[PDB]
Write a protein that binds this ligand. Structure first.
Ligand SMILES: N[C@@H](Cc1ccccc1)C(=O)O
Ligand SMILES: N[C@@H](Cc1ccccc1)C(=O)O
Ligand SMILES: N[C@@H](Cc1ccccc1)C(=O)O
Ligand SMILES: N[C@@H](Cc1ccccc1)C(=O)O
Ligand SMILES: [Cl-]
Ligand SMILES: [Cl-]
Ligand SMILES: [Cl-]
Ligand SMILES: [Mn+2]
Ligand SMILES: [Mn+2]
Ligand SMILES: [Mn+2]
Ligand SMILES: [Mn+2]
Lengths: 346, 346, 346, 344
């Protein structure tokens, strides 16, 4: 026999099943209530029943749980303070997806050394998400595959599908069965249609392969997800301004799906310059003051210390994309709370 | 206590593991040889060492294995006849990735009635692939997810990643560990960069989540795939002619990857008219007659009976994309063999 | 760091789960009916509601399925002929327990070569058992561990726990959850108390570890088995005669369990001499003629060809304990039918 | 379809696999060394290369981990004290194979809830803590699955009187990482235990699960470190005559003629106050000759006696045990007698 199986595989290793983590870290009654309620409050925004602004805000990536928890303490106070204008949810992303050289994130490589201790990574991820919900901070994350959600999606109040997978049929099928509302990014070249098609698709029932809670190969049958929306993240040019929002809203209505959308203040819309997220937020603030009816949320990349570093030396500073520091965070949130108070008052 | 888990899920159902199908339908010695040899022969085309034309030809999708086996019997004779000019490999795709409330393909719905019998579907897929190889017909397929490959990739001589997944980080990681050579399609809008980036990415080691042969949740560590190439499948306009082949070949060389490519005569290159595949094949033949040095392969949607039908009433006729029939298939293969015979003689 | 795990282990290999075999060889409607009815009819004998004689008869061990099935075809005629007097069930034991450098049975070694193809062995066992029930011949077997029953117990009408395991707590727990009636043998030196205690224990609920049908480590909670009885198989001294039956029945009643018992004509009661089976059976027929009210069944080791051999040269001749041949089998069965007819008519 | 599957089954429930417990409670470097070394030391006693007396001593069954650890803290001091004469290993048995409490793995809350995931975790956690403080552990393996959860923490294993003759339990012993003692039968029968040594030295196949919890076939290498345990039967078998008898038969079978004597169970006629009498007899044999004795078993707890409910702390709820004071005396007694033997 010539070999034909696993020719280009170095190793296949068993992971602990979801249920091993769920046994160690069950969702508490209070975390359950927060997640349940936060998903519902987000649905209300997606569907225009409430005019608060959803704000997904936090580090580009989580590389330190201690810092993430300190960040969440500071954020919670503003969450509460602005609760009538803003719905603040912490950004809890474990990786920056690069199909290239670079750290593969906290789940895949928690030790930051290339050892791929994924059992530890998943444990740490779940543990942080549970501690967050327990202190009263809801969590948001991006789902990159069809298996990881079984480990922690019970703790997630809002989920993202990235620009590179929005068109993927199987990722649309995943979104159709996510317990949380889901945002779809427009394409890497600014293509809106793939995200608009994604919202329609994810509303329907699908089948996809995954694993049971007990860790075994499975077929999953979804019910559909009515709570999906687009996320404007730039493309050929930035797409956050009134003209781009109006055009997207127009296309959304034509497709018969929600014309309420979210705008990334970071990444391509800021020209990959953290000091310009404020610029985008100010533009958004002005929209909310003039009208801004089609805006239901924004995303901001924020951390305890501004900027970036390429190794984790400075506490609370990003090792992936540069973030605004805490001072600028307070200023940006005050700005959007002020502006949206006026919108809501009409 | 509020519910937070599987809110939008109808059912999660354990499947028989890969080892069960592997036990019932082990790869034979002769099939092992055919797969091993065909992968190497395809590698030689991808890297420019052989000038035969890879021809990926057959149904848009397999909805009846009995008709697929008859097709293969006819195709085998031409595989043999043209073996000095063409390397013929049968198209064995189990579903057409569709955003439409329609048939989910042989794996998900093998009884064609909406019952979703996946154990039976995976068993049917493997059984067909084993019979194909045992008769002397190598098989090709598109891998839509990270789990199905564990059930039958050992029988696959060439694999596709489609236009909607070529940009996906996780599908690129899958390709980096597939035992077969892999073609990446250009984007649905015509974008070639996603496929060029995919070749580079898939050449390196990645990690991704999947299941073991025993069916347990697993982390997969790949070795990288040196046998990847692009597929021109059209965009806003078709991209099969000499000026598009030349532009694509410039871009491949500038990226430092193989500038040998495959052209799809169907889908957006035929603008969804099966009668135009022959016109595309004639343009390709003319290119091979004049020069055609960057062309290593073509794809063709072909069945026993031409056209398409919504229900599987006529035997050997597609229920997904419309295909050329057997007579036109003989003419098309005769044409490419004759033109490539000349290319090879220079 | 010193090693402590699996020091004396050569290999741990994954087995196909029970569900894989059940998938390929589901129990039929007719087999289901036969197994259900036969378990019922045997229960009737155990509890004195019917006075037919259970006869567990066939090869000491199955080493060839073709010959087992031919034996079954012959035995089936006699099962039908004598159905008003005898309840004939085929002996379908897969290994003989032996601490002596011996073939380890059809499940461990189905190729009869010292290879250990247990997937194939379990498949062969389930396949033979399904074929036997489908032809109208119910089947009996000995269960030696807590896992193998998951593969084929659904096809078993009567089960034994052997002399060497009757006192084992975990084997009694197994018997308490077996779907069939269970016979417990008296101990290897003739101890009866262990089998009497076993019946009492097995009537209660127990917990024991096993695997799920899907093949995963499991805790099993049993309901208790009310259809256990003892089997007299000899020891230091044979125990088949009237005086041994009467002392056994007295002890059974003193423990408040069924005083209906089975007598093995083979093994220690024949002194390993296959020609003594008929003399033991003649003694039992005499008991049935005079009274024999405590006898509900017998065991006989029988094959197409009498004797034994060390290698499987001759067709339908035992490679474990020596058996009686077919002609003697016909004689023995006509004997018991005639004698039990007189017992039943009283 | 008439039903034929699981007719007499209330439920079948998947368990957390061994890997889940291993992840939470990996064996430490220190525990690994202790286990590895203690198994070697025991092998040395089984084959007569060292003349220290193995002492398997502790509760009949473990129903409380708190009490077990306190017991182990006291026993450790005597383990060290008598280390040149005795090789002390703690008895850590989770069940008495009987109606009643099904033991610490099956019913860890002692209330009939049958929380087996909790049970196996508790068992493992207790075994790791013991080894981490320096007290090696022994246990009886009753089935073929439990060893995947904690056998890596076990320095000596038993197969009891009711399972010694079992083909499958012999097969298990043939793959156990620890030395294994086989008890004589409940009626006194020594032959089943002698045969078990021979069988267990050979390779076997038996069914079990992988560390990941999947149905598996286990191919063993054989266990060369098996021996018999004398535990009584019709009559107690601990005295000098019974020992010589047994030693001969071990020789006639070509297996190690060094053996263990249980001072409890049928040898004390189920009377915990007679264990000391049996130990005094063994002490006399050691003082005179006793060349064939490599070990003894003793059922000991913080507090003497037994009780039907777990009311008093450190008092057995299964077989009755000697208390701590008697344990001090008994160990002093055996150390002193074996010191003399080792001196000759
Ligand atoms: N458990 C996920 C859905 C899911 C099920 C199965 C596989 C993958 C995802 C949720 O609650 O959102
Ligand atoms: N078995 C696949 C590789 C693979 C392994 C694991 C998961 C997915 C894919 C092949 O031979 O191509
Ligand atoms: N399935 C067996 C009972 C059983 C269940 C689980 C483990 C072992 C045995 C029967 O029907 O008799
Ligand atoms: N893990 C056991 C051996 C074993 C393996 C598999 C099943 C049962 C037992 C040990 O180290 O002793
Ligand atoms: Cl993205
Ligand atoms: Cl983002
Ligand atoms: Cl396409
Ligand atoms: Mn970022
Ligand atoms: Mn198609
Ligand atoms: Mn026999
Ligand atoms: Mn005891």
């Amino acid at each position: 026999h010539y070999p034909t199986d696993d020719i280009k595989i170095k190793e296949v290793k068993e992971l602990l099943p979801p249920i091993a983590h769920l046994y160690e870290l069950p969702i508490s009654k209070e975390a359950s209530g927060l997640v349940h309620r936060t998903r519902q409050e987000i649905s209300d925004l997606v569907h225009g029943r409430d005019k608060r602004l959803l704000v997904i805000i936090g580090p580009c990536s989580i590389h330190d749980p201690k810092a993430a928890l300190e960040y969440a303490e500071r954020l919670l106070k503003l969450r509460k303070q602005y609760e009538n204008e803003l719905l603040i949810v912490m950004r809890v992303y474990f990786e920056k997806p690069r199909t290239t050289v670079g750290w593969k994130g906290l789940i895949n490589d928690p030790h930051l050394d290339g050892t791929f201790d994924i059992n530890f990574g998943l444990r740490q991820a779940r543990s942080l998400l549970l501690s967050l919900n327990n202190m009263g901070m809801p969590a948001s994350t991006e789902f990159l595959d069809m298996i990881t959600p079984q480990y922690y999606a019970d703790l997630i109040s809002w989920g993202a599908i990235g620009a590179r997978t929005t068109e993927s049929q199987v990722h649309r099928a995943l979104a159709s069965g996510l317990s949380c509302p889901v945002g779809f990014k427009n394409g890497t070249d600014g293509n809106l249609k793939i995200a608009i098609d994604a919202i329609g698709a994810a509303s329907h029932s699908h089948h996809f392969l995954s694993v049971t809670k007990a860790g075994h190969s499975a077929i999953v049958h979804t019910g559909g997800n009515p709570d999906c929306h687009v996320i404007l993240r730039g493309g050929k040019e930035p797409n956050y301004d009134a003209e781009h929002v109006s055009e997207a809203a127009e296309q959304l209505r034509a497709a018969g799906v929600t014309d309420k959308l979210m705008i990334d203040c970071s990444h391509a819309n800021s020209r990959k310059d953290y000091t310009r997220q404020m610029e985008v937020a100010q533009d958004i603030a002005a929209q909310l003051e003039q009208d801004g009816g089609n805006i239901m949320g924004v995303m901001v990349e924020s951390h305890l210390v501004e900027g970036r570093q390429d190794k984790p030396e400075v506490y609370g500073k990003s090792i992936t994309d540069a973030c605004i520091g805490w001072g600028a965070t307070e200023e940006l949130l005050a700005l959007l709370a002020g502006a949206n108070k006026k919108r809501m008052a009409r």
